[PDB]
Amino acid sequence: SKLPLVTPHTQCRLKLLKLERIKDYLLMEEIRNQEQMEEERSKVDDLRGTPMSVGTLEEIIDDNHAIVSTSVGSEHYVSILSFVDKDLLEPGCSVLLNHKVHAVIGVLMDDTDPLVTVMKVEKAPQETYADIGGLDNQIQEIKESVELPLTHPEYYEEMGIKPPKGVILYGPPGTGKTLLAKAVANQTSATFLRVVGSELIQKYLGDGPKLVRELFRVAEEHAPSIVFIDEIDAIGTKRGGEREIQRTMLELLNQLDGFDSRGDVKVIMATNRIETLDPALIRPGRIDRKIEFPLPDEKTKKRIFQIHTSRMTLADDVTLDDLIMAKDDLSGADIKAICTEAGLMALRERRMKVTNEDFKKSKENVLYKKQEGTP
Amino acid sequence: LQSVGQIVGEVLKQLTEEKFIVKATNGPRYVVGCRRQLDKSKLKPGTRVALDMTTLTIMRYLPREVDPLVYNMSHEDPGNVSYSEIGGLSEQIRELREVIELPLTNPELFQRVGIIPPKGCLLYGPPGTGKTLLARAVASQLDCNFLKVVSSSIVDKYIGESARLIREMFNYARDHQPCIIFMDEIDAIGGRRFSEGTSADREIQRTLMELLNQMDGFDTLHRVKMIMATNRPDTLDPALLRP
Amino acid sequence: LNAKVRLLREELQLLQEQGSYVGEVVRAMDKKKVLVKVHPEGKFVVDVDKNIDINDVTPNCRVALRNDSYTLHKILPNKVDPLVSLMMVEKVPDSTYEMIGG
Amino acid sequence: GDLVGVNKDSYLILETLPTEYDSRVKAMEVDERPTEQYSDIGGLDKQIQELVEAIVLPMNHKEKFENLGIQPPKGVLMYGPPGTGKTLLARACAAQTKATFLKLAGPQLVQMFIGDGAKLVRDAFALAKEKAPSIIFIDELDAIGT
Amino acid sequence: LRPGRIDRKIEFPPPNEEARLDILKIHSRKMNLTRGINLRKIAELMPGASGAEVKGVCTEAGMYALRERRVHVTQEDFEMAVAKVMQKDSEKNMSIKKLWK
Amino acid sequence: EFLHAQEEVKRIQSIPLVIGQFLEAVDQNTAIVGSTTGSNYYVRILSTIDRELLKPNASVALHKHSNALVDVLPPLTSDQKPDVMYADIGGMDIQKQEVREAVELPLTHFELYKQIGIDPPRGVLMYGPPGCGKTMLAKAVAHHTTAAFIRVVGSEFVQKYLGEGPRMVRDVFRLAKENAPAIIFIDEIDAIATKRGADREVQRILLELLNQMDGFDQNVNVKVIMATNRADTLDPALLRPGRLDRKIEFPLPDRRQKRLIFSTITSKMNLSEEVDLEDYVARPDKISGADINSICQESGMLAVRENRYIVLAKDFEKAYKTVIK
Amino acid sequence: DDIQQLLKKINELTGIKESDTGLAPPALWDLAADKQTLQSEQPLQVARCTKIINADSEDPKYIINVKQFAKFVVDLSDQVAPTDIEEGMRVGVDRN
Ligand SMILES: Nc1ncnc2c1ncn2[C@@H]1O[C@H](COP(=O)(O)OP(=O)(O)OP(=O)(O)O)[C@@H](O)[C@H]1O
Ligand SMILES: Nc1ncnc2c1ncn2[C@@H]1O[C@H](COP(=O)(O)OP(=O)(O)OP(=O)(O)O)[C@@H](O)[C@H]1O
Ligand SMILES: Nc1ncnc2c1ncn2[C@@H]1O[C@H](COP(=O)(O)OP(=O)(O)O)[C@@H](O)[C@H]1O
Ligand SMILES: Nc1ncnc2c1ncn2[C@@H]1O[C@H](COP(=O)(O)OP(=O)(O)O)[C@@H](O)[C@H]1O
């Protein structure tokens, strides 16, 4: 759970009003009053006499009998009591046992699989459409294939379409490709799964494709979910590494479609080098949509500072339009440095408020970081 | 029938003439006391003793260690193979008896020569030239303790069990001097040490270094003359092939 | 003298109680039931005794049980946790700014 | 190294037991005894006669060899492009011999454990010994024959 | 050196004359001294030497105390405790001129 | 009555106790112990035990049934001497002097490093490709040193028992700690120190090894000798110069270094008067110290081959060519 | 900062959120039959059969392997026929 967000970040008594309202509600919530003013528990908890043990179950022989193994490794054919959720018990789960006769006495909160625990990324609440500057064509297109199918399948249900199963995002680095997809996760309710293509390339023979199975398995139990494959080009381009990468690629194409069903999860991929990946990725039957991310133009850039300069204290001499004219020289990620370097720059000026000169001494340092060649 | 078995374990350091320390084999370490009659001198650090399962008191020291694997690898029967049954290897056959037979039969000879005897020497050649046959002949004719090794079977899955097996077979050879160890297909574990690998590489190189410490030095094997053969001497680690 | 002998008698009486294991928690499941991890064996869901306020049991608290019915006993000092912590992790480095000059 | 059954509390030995080898090795032996006759193999009379006189004659006669004094051949390798019928000849040889037949493929012996495959090989040979007149069939030997 | 990754270019120059002297003084607390060890004059004998090497000259002065098996830490000691340190910071560098040229 | 109570208190710590390792204490009357059975227990401690004897690696005896901790257990190479002296070493005098300063100097000249001041290294490692006399020099030190040498190999540390192998490391370092001047030799550190379930357990023994090395600062005179041929492996954590500063590389013997090795070994031999050792010290073949022995041993066998006593010149090159390539 | 610390207060005073997994809905379960099968039924143990002895063919004896636990020579309960058991067979056994 989380609190709502105050509307204006600017220092003002409106924010004071909002924060004191949330304070008032939190004070009404402040438990003390209620803390001041049987058969179900008594019987079954007697049946599960303490202490309890946790065991791994992989069998269901009857609707009241199964094989259960404990941590030491021994296996036991034990009976299931009535109060155990039958649907909850599935092979590989952890099950509570009676300490005397090892009878199955309930399912447990599954808490394991650390790698996918990292993989179910946070809700990405820090990213929002309000934080994206003027990617209008991308938004509507990504709304067509990702957000809308996960929000109102009614159009697809009525009209008879099968909604697109995959989208690939291409553009120069820093254009905001990852930020958009993360914002979609925030915009929708679907859980977010992010993975960078370089990571799934694994040393051992078969784990690489196994992780691909491991991911799309993870997406399925979450039901509405997003799988974000960042910088896909590492595993998709052209052609003992050679064979495994091909094997890994084919695993995607089998989980991006292939046999069986795919449920509801949508797949979003990102890369900088669309002109390099395998035609199978460009395959307009395998991947239905390819979204373009151009370098920000004049109007898009102005929004970017408006997004990024919203938080510092500014002077009246700042001329954002002048910093825009030159070209689409720098992406938004570069412009984040433009704000960040300036914020540091104005800080070095011993002033807590930034001026236009700080942005000029912000723009140049960003530029020298570029390379040299063809003189 | 009315009798009962006794737990087995290896006496560690000695505290008082009535307090001892035994690791009960693969069990814990138990402070225990000698019963009444055992000659305390015999209860050396490391000797093998049996304990009452009730009071844990030591009641008999035993012949040193265990492992019928070594028993099988000793009582392997190669059959009667005279050196004449091998043909066309007179130089090599004569050579082997100079490093396998003369030192243990007549050690006093090299005292006057001064040169200490070599302990191990390796047979290498293409398949089908009689290496294993020569080893069988040596085992059949010579009158001494002979160990026959398949380098594969001395490699077990249990963690750190293969190095232990090498240690116990060397201990058996030392306790049963003079002894001959024959390790056929030594390249099975003698392969060059990988810089990285699975548990396979880890434990195989571990066993290799165990065997190395066993034969290399600090222990200066007394009558532990050793023979190995391989079809692929190249893959052998240079540590072994060291003279 | 009587205090000494009474103390010895209490010590003897206490010596009969068993070792009560050692356990560690990753979740306070219920206000009575507290899941624990013992060493070795496996995971267990255990009720707390009358003492020890349930708010005090935190993840990785390194608690002690009782010997039978497992049962929770007390909290104990925290672990040392020396995993890695040699080549990667350093707790309190010994270098300060005054040990550098030039 | 023998196997005995002892008292579960006093550990006194009261049994003598068959060794047992492994689940894989017990699954390795042939009990169905397939029924392909040499007539169903066609065009290989040279090869069928070769394998038969190599294997079955020591099984049946064993007196021709001792009369001549030769050691009978002990290893027969069948090779050729797939579809030539090597597996069929092995099946027929199992069909007609009446001897203890052990069939297995190369991948059945690899395993992941450190010594496991060596144990299977050794224990299968031990079972072939304990059954006395026995034949072992390796199919796709190149799996471990690499 | 890109946005969001790194923000500056701290440089480590070779220690200066007085700077190398301070390095010596850092490890000089433990070491004893004669009736007049002038570290200033010792400092200037290694132009362009790195920092750990200035520790090294103190380090190589270490087993020179074992060269006499008693409290040495002498002014002369560092003069040859310089000598064996610099060559490791050297040798092929002489050829390197005749090599790269 | 008080005498009777003390008699019973003696009775409770009788012979059949079980050994464990004392972890940190909890209160005046209780403590945490790790049993040799593998598990750990929350245990009340007998008052008669001197608490100052209790240390977080102490070997402590537990009650067989109640696991009650009542005892402190008083925690090598005596007759198994390597039987070799420095003179019979193949003239690695540069290595001899360095190791002399490395290990022998800290014992016989321990008090020097306060007036001397500078702190020498705390443990050594050697690369010494096979046949470079590492074990002799290690053996030579053992026969010569007044310390209490204890020999280990990396292979002994890895056991079948889970959680017992790493514990064995402590006994190595505990025993040396008790024998204040002792020296530890862990040749074949190849095995355990490989670069980082069953995989974890082996590295746990290395992890326990790494902790014990760090505890040997000043006021602990023990020094650790680690030998390994490959040595391009081994985790950099153990390679850390902060704890294994001094290292000794043994190269293949060169002229002079070669000539000492023939002269040393042949000194025990007989040889004829016309023996030309100078040709072999001049031959370009890069024979290591082990080969020199083999080159010399084979001369005796060739002499004993023909029933002859003295080795003549013809013997050596027959042997010389027979070994090497 | 007061908002933050007061939220931490509320979370503490509310108590630990019950990580109780839960059971089936109450209307379906318990019954005296649960306690009945708990007190009556045998906690059988899983094992792997091996190499039926069949020395006398009357009580043929069976060697089983309680995997991770032990190996044993056992008989059958009188309910199960010997013809119902083959080699290996993954057979479960009683605990006593
Ligand atoms: N010189 C020889 N004299 C007599 N028989 C020989 C000779 N060389 C080979 N043989 C015959 O060939 C076989 C010798 O091979 P053996 O089993 O001894 O091992 P190998 O081929 O040298 O190698 P390995 O067993 O290590 O693969 C025997 O059957 C033996 O009869
Ligand atoms: N000479 C033959 N006579 C009769 N059938 C044959 C013959 N050769 C091949 N076959 C047919 O081949 C089929 C299966 O091929 P088989 O496995 O025996 O051959 P193969 O070349 O040894 O193949 P593989 O090595 O892949 O097992 C059988 O069903 C059989 O009918
Ligand atoms: N159009 C945009 N609107 C808002 N932020 C942007 C935009 N373009 C770039 N950014 C900034 O760049 C970052 C996103 O970088 P992105 O292009 O997603 O990385 P990648 O190139 O690895 O996909 C965000 O932190 C954001 O602040
Ligand atoms: N200088 C030498 N003089 C005589 N023998 C040597 C010499 N150097 C090596 N050796 C031979 O090698 C052994 C010395 O140990 P070494 O084999 O070098 O250990 P490792 O090879 O395990 O590092 C001795 O047994 C000896 O036979």
Ligand SMILES: [Mg+2]
């Ligand atoms: Mg052979």
Ligand SMILES: [Mg+2]
């Ligand atoms: Mg086939």
